[PDB]
Design a binder for this molecule. Structure first.
Ligand SMILES: O=C(CO)[C@H](O)[C@H](O)COP(=O)(O)O
Length: 152
């Protein structure tokens, strides 16, 4: 949809997947912002790119989304969740992709480049974007996370 931006980044492990996802979503008429890296550096550091995406999502945490890729998804998930207003979900199977939105209201999707195929990652992205937050008891739970980070 034209009303929000999707920010995408990776470390050096995820450049091919990042382009596949970015171009896939652009064809579907999403607003997609590739924050890098734009060339391969075997030694680059996933937190730098996680914070680029997460700091953008933080500015529009109710509308914008992030996609972050690293070897397992773990590092970018840890880093992105440090950012105020960010709820980052690590998904490695289509079987949990919708739930990350439905229950956890995630605004950042974290993916594995080394342990999940390109095809499965595209399916994860598609189901995450198609799903909707279910609210209710899940809103009460997310509210507790937001309150902790704001008050601690
Ligand atoms: O998976 C990751 C973080 O969770 C990183 O992509 C991974 O640690 C990078 O490994 P290397 O420096 O050997 O390429």
């Amino acid at each position: 949809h034209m009303s929000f931006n999707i920010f995408i980044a990776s470390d050096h492990t995820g450049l091919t997947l990042k382009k596949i996802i970015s171009e896939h979503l652009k064809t579907k008429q999403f607003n997609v912002v590739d924050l890098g890296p734009n060339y391969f550096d075997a030694n680059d550091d996933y937190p730098d790119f996680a914070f680029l995406v997460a700091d953008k999502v933080k500015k529009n945490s109710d509308k914008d989304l992030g996609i972050l890729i690293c070897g397992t998804g773990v590092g970018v998930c840890m880093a992105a969740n440090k950012v105020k207003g960010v709820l980052a979900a690590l998904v490695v199977s289509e079987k949990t992709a919708a739930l990350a939105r439905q229950h956890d209201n995630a605004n950042v999707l974290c993916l594995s480049s080394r342990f999940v195929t390109d095809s499965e990652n595209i399916k994860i992205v598609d189901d995450f974007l198609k799903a909707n937050f279910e609210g209710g008891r899940h809103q009460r739970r997310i509210d507790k996370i937001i309150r902790y980070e704001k008050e601690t």
